[PDB]
């Protein structure tokens, strides 16, 4: 649990002078909040006969599978997981400010487009008083940005070297591939039927050091589940538990169509 | 018995209301028992934009050309005049495009971030944002408001003055504070005025 | 892993749109209020608070409905012309926004809320219930 | 000195005796039911529990009523029909002595309670409310 400063109400206005008295302003709030964690476990059974006389080992393969599945599922839940028995994904709460672009008409068809105007406008539309805030998107959409052309035919970025290589990160760009990559593969920017999709998420940009948190308590544990083993089988049990939660969904903005 | 401490919370809230109310009053204060806000002073040199036409349907509009003209049209003999505007205006400007597709500023860098100190421009996010909030009212059609404060520029060292007399004082109101209740009182002493509304231009729609 | 948060903090219907319900708080030491709207409001609404004593006929049933007097805090700017406690819900409260309240001075054994006259048509779209805090027995 | 426990453990109307009402729990992380009898019943009264999902039309409007499933645990040896989450208040139940409960496993956005078939006439004289805890939003 933890406190949450809601606001600081108005206390003193600018008074007249025929008042030896004064005026009472209402206070703010402290708005206490709570939160919990979430579990993650499972089992499997092997056949001692198959396990022993086998081509080679299967166990360490299963242990590595456990660790990788745990990591990837944790990440995907942190991204999009619901509040029900899981940490609520910040992308799903729909309380982060999410904007969308107007669909450029194509002689009769208002059509989705991630026009470079919209991107540059978004990245520069963020209160700098919150400090710096990094942006995240898929590699495919980034490469799509690198391939934008004018009415003439020249590139819009790095004209004359056939590679944009924009020196990322150094400006707020952190590329991941867990995001829903509005470019389906690389086949969504199609001005014709291939249009990028009514209301699809494009990118994000937030000050994540205070916009979202992840709590970690329990690492992975693996026990030999005695009681399920029958001298013909073996059953292992595992588990780990942790959680996550949004800080305040006003320190980050989201893109859509 | 409180779980929290209301005292320091109230002190901080009072100082915050002091600062923010002083700025908002110094900007738009309505004269009576408060400094007259130089925005509402309404003697400060102002200039509207031009009814740009599109689809034979004129619409209020605004271009970087008009902005540069407004900047350079200052009577330099007055002295150096700092300019101020909302950040959304800076976004609108850094996102201007030619008839070809090229950015009018910082072409091929995904941004446009000069140091706004030699550029002689400053941002106040509560200076009335010309855009109806960012973007929503921005431009083209069903947007771009009208006869609205776009930006300001002045030799503020002689355009507006602020007078300070006494900082914040706080004390327990002895009268009325029984053994069952307790009450505190506070105050300060500030003010301001306009020097001479002939040292700066205003850009309006 | 939601705990059985009903065995403590037990809630009871106070006003189901068209009927009040006296609730006994003797077994407890603290109790608040919870207001909810079900539709769109038209004008502000007012409610009067009543309390009840053990009826002489039965020591475990509420008596009559005595109006609750308002107790002023410090920094008070207005007092009800009758001096009796009362509450009011302002206009423009969308019916997806709970509301909380609490009288700091209790008296009697049963509490009740009633829609103040003239402001009872909108009360139909208003729901009120109350939780408690103490054990004391 | 009763704290305003409206905020910090609010509550809502779940079953007035005439119809159910969806009560949102997603904004919270703990919740429970409080039952109350307006009088003595005639027989054991059983209730079905339902949960919903945000309608495709709007993410803040109740959708269909999905039947929450029963979840047993270590000492549960009375697994009932089709493992559905349903409760039953027995007979020999009086006013001024409440009962409480809650579902161990959560799913959905808001919960609702309905008179299971056969208890409707008797359930017409019971009041069900829900208390929350740990709101995070």
């Amino acid at each position: 649990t933890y406190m949450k400063i809601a606001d600081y109400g108005q206390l003193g206005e600018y008074t007249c002078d025929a008042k030896c008295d004064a005026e009472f302003g209402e206070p703010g709030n402290i708005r206490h909040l709570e939160g919990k964690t979430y579990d993650y476990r499972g089992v499997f059974c092997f056949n001692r006969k198959n396990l022993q006389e086998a081509n080679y080992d299967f166990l360490s393969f299963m242990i590595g599978a456990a660790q990788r599945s745990h990591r990837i599922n944790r990440n995907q839940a942190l991204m999009i997981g619901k509040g029900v028995n899981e940490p609520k994904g910040w992308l799903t709460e729909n309380c982060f400010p999410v904007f969308q672009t107007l669909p450029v008409d194509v002689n009769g068809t208002s059509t989705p487009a991630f026009l470079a105007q919209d991107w540059r406008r978004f990245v520069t539309s963020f209160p700098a008083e919150y400090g710096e805030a990094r942006s995240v998107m898929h590699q495919n959409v980034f490469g799509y940005l690198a391939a934008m052309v004018d009415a003439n035919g020249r590139f819009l970025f790095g004209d004359g070297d056939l590679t944009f290589t924009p020196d990322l990160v150094r400006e707020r760009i952190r590329i991941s591939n867990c995001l829903p990559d509005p470019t389906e593969g690389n086949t969504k920017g199609g001005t014709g039927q291939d249009a990028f999709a009514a209301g699809s998420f494009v990118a994000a940009q937030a000050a994540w050091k205070t916009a979202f948190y992840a709590v970690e308590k329990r690492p992975m544990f693996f026990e030999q589940y005695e009681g399920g083993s029958s001298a013909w089988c073996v059953k292992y049990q595992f588990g780990a538990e942790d959680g996550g939660f949004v800080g305040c969904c006003e320190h980050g903005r989201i893109l859509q169509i | 018995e409180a779980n929290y401490d209301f005292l320091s919370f109230m002190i901080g809230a009072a100082q915050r209301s002091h600062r923010i109310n002083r700025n908002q009053a110094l900007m738009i204060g309505k004269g009576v028992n408060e400094p007259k806000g130089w925005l509402t002073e309404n003697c400060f040199p102002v200039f509207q934009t031009l009814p740009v036409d599109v689809n034979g349907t004129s619409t209020p509009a605004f271009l970087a050309q008009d902005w540069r003209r407004f900047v350079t049209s200052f009577p330099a003999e007055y002295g150096e005049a700092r300019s101020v505007m909302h950040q959304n205006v800076f976004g609108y400007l850094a996102a201007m495009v030619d008839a070809n597709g090229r950015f009018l500023f910082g072409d091929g860098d995904l941004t446009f971030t000069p140091d706004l100190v030699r550029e002689r421009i400053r941002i106040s996010n509560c200076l009335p944002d010309p855009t109806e909030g960012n973007t929503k009212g921005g431009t083209g059609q069903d947007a771009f408001a009208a006869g609205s404060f776009v930006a300001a520029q002045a030799a503020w060292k002689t355009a507006f003055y602020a007078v300070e007399k006494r900082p914040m004082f706080f004390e327990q109101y002895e009268g009325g504070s029984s053994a069952w209740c307790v009450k505190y009182q506070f105050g300060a002493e500030d003010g301001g005025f306009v020097g001479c509304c002939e040292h700066g231009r205003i850009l309006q729609i | 892993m939601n705990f059985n948060v009903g065995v403590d903090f037990p809630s009871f219907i106070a006003w189901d749109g068209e009927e009040s319900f006296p609730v006994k708080v003797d077994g407890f030491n603290q109790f608040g209020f919870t207001f909810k709207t079900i539709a769109a409001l038209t004008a502000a609404t007012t409610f009067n608070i009543f309390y009840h004593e053990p009826s002489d006929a039965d020591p475990c049933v509420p008596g009559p409905a005595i109006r609750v007097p308002e107790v002023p805090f410090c920094d008070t700017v207005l007092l009800s012309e009758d001096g009796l406690a009362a509450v009011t819900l302002p206009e423009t409260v969308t019916p997806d926004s709970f509301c909380a309240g609490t009288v700091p001075c209790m008296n009697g054994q049963w509490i009740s809320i009633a829609p103040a006259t003239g402001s009872e048509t909108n009360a139909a779209n208003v729901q009120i219930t109350v939780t408690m805090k103490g054990a004391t027995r | 000195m009763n704290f305003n426990v409206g905020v910090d453990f609010p509550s809502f109307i779940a079953w007035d005796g005439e119809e159910s009402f969806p009560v949102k729990v997603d904004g919270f992380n703990q919740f429970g039911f409080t039952f109350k009898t307006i009088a003595a019943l005639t027989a054991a009264t059983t209730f079905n529990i339902f949960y919903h999902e945000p309608s495709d039309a709007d993410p803040c409007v109740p959708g269909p009523a999905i039947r929450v499933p029963e979840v047993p645990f270590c000492d549960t040896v009375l697994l009932s029909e089709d493992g559905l989450a349903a409760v039953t208040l027995p007979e020999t139940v009086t006013p001024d002595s409440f009962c409480a409960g809650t579902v161990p496993c959560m799913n959905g956005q808001w919960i609702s309670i309905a008179p299971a078939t056969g208890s409707e006439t008797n359930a017409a004289n019971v009041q069900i409310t829900v208390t929350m805890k740990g709101a995070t939003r």
């Binding site: 729909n94 904007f99 969308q100 105007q117 | 929503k136 | 302002p90 997806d96 926004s97 709970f98 609490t102 | -």
Partner: peptide, 28 residues
């Protein structure tokens, strides 16, 4: 003695039309 502190349930969309400076047509 209302003291009616209150908050809503879940908020609602934030889709602000991300309009942007159009093409410069021509003053004239």
């Amino acid at each position: 003695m209302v003291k009616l502190n209150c908050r809503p349930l879940c908020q609602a969309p934030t889709a602000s039309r991300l309009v942007s400076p159009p093409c410069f047509i021509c003053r004239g």
